[PDB]
């Protein structure tokens, strides 16, 4: 019979009505000292977590996602996230933390494989500012959900969305976040988001390198010791390093940072990895760093890089074949004088 997503409608209607409640408060918020009363709408008193929790679970299925997209679900969930962040700031309140996490999980699912929803969410600038700001939250699980959203927003982004992600300071915020995270799984999401952002433009690459301690940290991630039986951190960190190494190659200071954290020698060890992503990333980084610098050319020569790169030039993987060969040409074309006697 009349069997539609009316429960979903009811759950969206709950969230829109709570959103409405909140915007009445902040419309009425007399700048600064609103009054002695001090009561914002509390999301617990509206039972919002259960509502957003249900929409989050429904968002794993594609058919419910289609229904959600017809009924403006992404706009409502994003609005919910924004307003709570704006009202209560960077709280450790578990009810507020849980709310933002579940909202962010739904936005992650809703932006997955959906270029329109990526653009819509990116066009909601206030929500995007809230997301970025939540990377400074003391909840590392919130950070992790926030980075998951930005990871999907940074993948197959249209040019305006790419422009917005840059303008809201997502790149700097993710890199500064990364330096302070303890939980491995949080770091994965954070570095997954950065790896994506790092391929967009020179400006994003430059901003990653400009963050204090960021290149030293990224070199450290190359020898990360996982507690989750995965190479995600080495792959993502090295992938970020590969994309930004085009700029590091022009910069003697940034090269010197890499040298003192044993980067080139680690990149050579990475050529023997059982992850082909790690080998590929290293071949890309070595390609860049072996151009236009005698110091690192001579250093790679001394570490046996030429013999190591030879072994991969006939690889069946294309970027390993291309990456090792181009780095090999550079070293062959700049043979140090002491290897001609």
């Amino acid at each position: 019979g009349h069997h539609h997503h009316h429960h979903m409608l009811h759950l969206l209607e709950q969230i829109r009505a709570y959103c409405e409640t909140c915007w009445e408060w902040q419309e009425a918020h007399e700048p600064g000292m609103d009054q002695d009363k001090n009561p914002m709408p509390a999301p617990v008193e509206h039972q919002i977590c259960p509502a957003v929790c249900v929409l989050m679970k429904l968002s794993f299925d594609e058919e419910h996602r289609h229904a959600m997209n017809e009924l403006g679900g992404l706009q409502a969930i994003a609005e919910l996230l924004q307003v709570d962040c704006e009202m209560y700031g960077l709280t450790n309140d578990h009810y507020s933390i849980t709310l933002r996490r579940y909202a962010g999980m739904a936005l992650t699912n809703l932006t997955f494989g959906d270029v329109a929803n990526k653009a819509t969410l990116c066009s909601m600038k206030g929500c995007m500012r809230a997301l970025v700001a939540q990377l400074k939250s003391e909840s590392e699980d919130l950070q992790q959900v926030i980075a998951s959203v930005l990871r999907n927003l940074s993948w197959r982004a249209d040019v305006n969305s790419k422009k917005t992600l840059r303008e809201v300071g997502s790149v700097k915020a993710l890199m500064e976040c990364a330096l302070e995270v303890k939980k491995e799984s949080t770091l994965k999401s954070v570095l997954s988001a950065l790896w994506n952002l790092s391929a967009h433009c020179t400006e994003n690459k430059a901003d990653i390198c400009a963050v204090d301690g960021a290149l030293a940290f990224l070199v450290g991630t190359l020898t990360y010791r996982s507690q989750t039986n995965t190479l995600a951190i080495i792959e993502s960190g090295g992938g970020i390093l590969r994309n930004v190494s085009s700029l590091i190659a022009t910069n003697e200071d940034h090269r010197q940072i890499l040298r003192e954290n044993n980067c080139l020698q680690t990149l050579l060890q990475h050529l023997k990895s059982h992850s082909l992503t790690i080998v590929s990333n290293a071949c890309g980084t070595l390609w860049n760093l072996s151009a236009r610098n005698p110091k690192d050319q001579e250093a790679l020569w001394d570490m046996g890089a030429v013999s190591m790169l030879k072994n991969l030039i006939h690889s069946k993987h294309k970027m390993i074949a291309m990456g090792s060969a181009a780095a090999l040409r550079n070293l062959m074309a700049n043979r140090p004088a002491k290897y001609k006697d």
Partner: peptide
């Protein structure tokens, strides 16, 4: 890093 459902 690609894209993904939440995990």
């Amino acid at each position: 890093a690609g894209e993904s459902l939440y995990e």
